[PDB]
Design a protein around this ligand. Structure first.
Ligand SMILES: *[C@@H]1O[C@H](CO)[C@@H](O)[C@H](O)[C@H]1NC(C)=O
Ligand SMILES: *[C@@H]1O[C@H](CO)[C@@H](O)[C@H](O)[C@H]1NC(C)=O
Ligand SMILES: *[C@@H]1O[C@H](CO)[C@@H](O)[C@H](O)[C@H]1NC(C)=O
Ligand SMILES: *[C@@H]1O[C@H](CO)[C@@H](O)[C@H](O)[C@H]1NC(C)=O
Ligand SMILES: *[C@@H]1O[C@H](CO)[C@@H](O)[C@H](O)[C@H]1NC(C)=O
Ligand SMILES: *[C@@H]1O[C@H](CO)[C@@H](O)[C@H](O)[C@H]1NC(C)=O
Ligand SMILES: OC[C@H]1O[C@@H](O)[C@H](O)[C@@H](O)[C@@H]1O
Lengths: 384, 312
């Protein structure tokens, strides 16, 4: 109905603001488990969970909606997913300028009913081919999956899985790979091995990309940190958050809200400056369900979950595993085959400088939608 | 003997004395072995900063703690406020005597003492969130430099509970207590030092012993007997099994072999460095596998920003 479409436009933004707050909650739970490099996709994570919220009912479904920081959206039935599932489309479709390998899988047990309802209706939204499996012949099941993925991923992700419980009702994966074309690629003539303080008492040596010219940035005088916009091609952007020399980056995480991010997005000021930025490459897989449990989404991972709508067959159906693998790399050329060229015309020998030689946070969002593609933290540029 | 160990690396000029050796490290280095660098910060540097150090480009740089200033030295931390976490010249071992200025007890509508706390600033007191929340008329009580008959009583104006506190997860169990009046220091009491993360996790906690000042509960001898006790870091790995608990990134463990239930929650661990005491941990509700000798503390070095934001 034309009624629906009129709504989906005003709800675009509210949905983006909320899954960024969901993303910062996730980041915090992870940060509780370790201090190392971190990277995951807030968007791909909501998208995936939302699909499940479709097949769920009552207490189960309700709890997911609240847990994803979006019970405030008061729509009609499935419209909530098209937002996410079609945002996925606009990004992988007409947008070649960026990345962007992305997809998900629903490897289910080989006995679930899966009516022609939530199987075709969900394929119309999710577009994630479910794949009944022989979790009994566990050894055979592992191979099949790793292969399925090794295919749709193009070897980018080789062997995702290691083990598989014989009694595995349902496993849900989501991957997302990214490396784009800089709006202003770095000149490899200027990248040099430089000092990177892994912390005040330990330091190492890392390749340090250099770039000059016009960048948009801002310094939050309250928390005392630099915020830097590194534009990609295709209206995707990377925010780099760099605490002043003394303060620790771990502290800032407690204060990350969508409101904050946008308050210093608006105080952005474009100007001429020098920037030193470290090459890196983060690749990580998270057993998201373990984390989404600590965050409150529990029922859909427990015996008494209502996936009645999905597969009425009643034994003990429930999501068994949810795992997201995500990869992101940053050199100075990206997907382009040649790097960039530096020509100095500003002109001055005293423009602002900004060295990323401490650990930092980075976000990757689509300027169009405002949706958070990548939430990350780089403490050690050398590994990952 | 003696310049046989080749103990001088990085171009170290070995001046063979008669009983020991000496070195003149290649320019841009230092130390009795030349394993240092004026570039970075090393925990071994004895002649370094007195408080906080910042790895610079040429040389390193020194910061000072709350209430201090650097002498013309540029490395020293001359205390002048005066409110700067310096324990009076006073040695305390088997006889704790409850004579440390920053410790404090919490009472409610009646003389009931249910929790402990630490003076963090002249008008703020740190304690666990769980405690701060079980009574709505908290008062701060100190016995420091006072006739046991009457203590010092101060009402709590407002309680700032950490905004990311989750009781279920037992994470971020911390609160800041706003005092109605400032503490008349150094007489009435004195704030303990709050450490910078890296400093506290690289040369303090791993490299030196701290003491766990608090009180046992629920019981005593009809008085305020503050009982201290040495503790050392327990590697989180082991600590895992030993307590049947998962150690988040904002908590760590200690041990002493003195089987005392430091029930009082506001109990705290501190460590001293070059003549100043630093609040290293706050004792949550360490449980339940006790195993009383091992303790589960809240890593205070992590909440540095939360303090500055609230207290300014
Ligand atoms: C698992 O089952 C498949 C059925 O096609 C069989 O071919 C395979 O040999 C089995 N694996 C093992 C380890 O026996
Ligand atoms: C999209 O990104 C480009 C990058 O050059 C930017 O100039 C433009 O303002 C953005 N707007 C839209 C609507 O695409
Ligand atoms: C200093 O150390 C270097 C290491 O390459 C060595 O080659 C050189 O001989 C040393 N210099 C002196 C003065 O001994
Ligand atoms: C609470 O504290 C006030 C002082 O602020 C005190 O006079 C009163 O007796 C206490 N009792 C209750 C129940 O509030
Ligand atoms: C209190 O503090 C002062 C100053 O330190 C000290 O001289 C005095 O002996 C202390 N005694 C009592 C009971 O207040
Ligand atoms: C927690 O401790 C108990 C001690 O009996 C043990 O049975 C259980 O396996 C432990 N849980 C773990 C290690 O996750
Ligand atoms: O003789 C100076 C040094 O040489 C080397 C040895 O390992 C040390 O034990 C000794 O102190």
């Amino acid at each position: 109905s034309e009624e629906e479409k009129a709504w989906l436009m005003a709800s675009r933004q509210q949905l983006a603001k909320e899954t960024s707050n969901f993303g910062f909650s996730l980041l915090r739970k992870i940060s509780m488990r370790h201090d190392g490099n971190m990277v995951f996709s807030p968007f791909g994570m909501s998208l995936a969970m939302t699909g499940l919220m479709l097949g769920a009912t009552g207490p189960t479904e309700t709890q997911i909606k609240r847990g994803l920081h979006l019970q405030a959206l008061k729509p009609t039935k499935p419209g909530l997913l098209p937002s996410l599932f079609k945002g996925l489309r606009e990004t992988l479709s007409r947008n070649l300028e960026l990345g962007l390998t992305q997809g998900s899988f629903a490897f289910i047990h080989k006995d679930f009913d899966v009516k022609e309802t939530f199987f075709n209706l969900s394929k119309r939204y999710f577009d994630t081919e479910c794949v009944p499996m022989n979790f009994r012949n566990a050894s055979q099941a592992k191979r099949l999956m790793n292969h399925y993925i090794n295919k749709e991923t193009r070897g980018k992700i080789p062997k995702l899985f290691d083990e598989i419980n014989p009694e595995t009702k349902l496993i849900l994966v989501d991957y997302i790979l990214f490396k784009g074309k800089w709006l202003t690629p770095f000149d490899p003539v200027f990248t040099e091995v430089d000092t990177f303080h892994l912390d005040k008492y330990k330091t190492i040596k890392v390749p340090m990309m250099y770039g000059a010219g016009k960048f948009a940035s801002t310094f939050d005088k309250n928390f005392r940190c630099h915020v830097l916009k590194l534009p990609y091609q295709g209206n995707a952007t990377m925010l780099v958050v760099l605490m002043e020399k003394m303060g620790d980056h771990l502290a800032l995480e407690d204060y990350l809200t969508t409101d904050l991010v946008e308050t210093w997005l608006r105080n952005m000021k474009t100007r001429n400056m020098e920037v030193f930025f470290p090459k890196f490459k983060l690749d990580q897989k998270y057993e998201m369900h373990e984390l989404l449990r600590q965050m409150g989404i529990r029922r859909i991972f427990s015996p008494f979950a209502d996936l009645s709508e999905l597969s009425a067959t009643g034994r003990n159906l429930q999501v068994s595993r949810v795992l997201q693998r995500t990869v992101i790399e940053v050199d100075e050329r990206g997907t382009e085959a040649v790097a960039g060229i530096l020509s100095e015309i500003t002109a001055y020998s005293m423009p602002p400088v900004i060295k990323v030689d401490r650990p930092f946070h980075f976000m990757i969002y689509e300027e169009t939608s405002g949706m958070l593609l990548f939430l990350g933290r780089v403490v050690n540029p050398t590994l990952l | 003997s003696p310049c046989i160990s080749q103990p001088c690396l990085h171009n170290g000029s070995c001046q063979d004395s008669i009983w020991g050796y000496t070195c003149t490290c290649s320019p841009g280095y230092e130390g009795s072995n030349c394993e240092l660098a004026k570039n970075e910060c090393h925990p071994e540097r004895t002649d370094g900063c007195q408080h906080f150090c910042l790895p610079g480009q040429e040389s390193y740089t020194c910061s000072c703690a709350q209430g201090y200033r650097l002498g013309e030295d540029h490395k020293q931390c001359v205390p002048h406020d005066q409110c700067a976490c310096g324990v009076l010249t006073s040695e305390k071992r088997a006889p704790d005597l409850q004579d440390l200025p920053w410790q404090v007890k919490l009472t409610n509508s009646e003389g009931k003492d249910f929790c402990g706390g630490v003076i963090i600033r002249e008008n703020f007191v740190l304690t666990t969130a769980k405690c701060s929340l079980l009574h709505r008329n908290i008062t701060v009580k100190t016995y420091f430099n006072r006739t046991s008959q009457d203590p010092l009583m101060i009402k709590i104006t407002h309680v700032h509970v950490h905004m990311r506190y989750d009781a279920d997860a037992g994470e971020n169990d911390l609160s800041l207590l706003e005092l109605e009046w400032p503490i008349q220091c150094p007489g009435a009491g004195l704030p303990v030092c709050t450490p910078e993360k890296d400093f506290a996790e690289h040369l303090l906690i791993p490299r030196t012993r701290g003491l766990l000042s608090g009180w046992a509960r629920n019981g005593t001898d009809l008085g305020n007997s503050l009982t201290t006790r040495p503790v050392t870091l327990v590697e989180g790995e082991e600590c895992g099994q030993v307590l049947n608990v998962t150690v988040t990134t904002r908590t760590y463990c200690e041990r002493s072999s003195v089987a005392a239930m430091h029930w009082m929650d506001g109990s705290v661990v501190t460590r001293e460095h070059r003549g100043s005491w630093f609040l290293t941990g706050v004792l949550g509700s360490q449980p339940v596998g006790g195993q009383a000798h091992m303790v589960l503390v809240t890593k205070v070095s992590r909440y540095s920003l939360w303090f500055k934001q609230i207290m300014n």
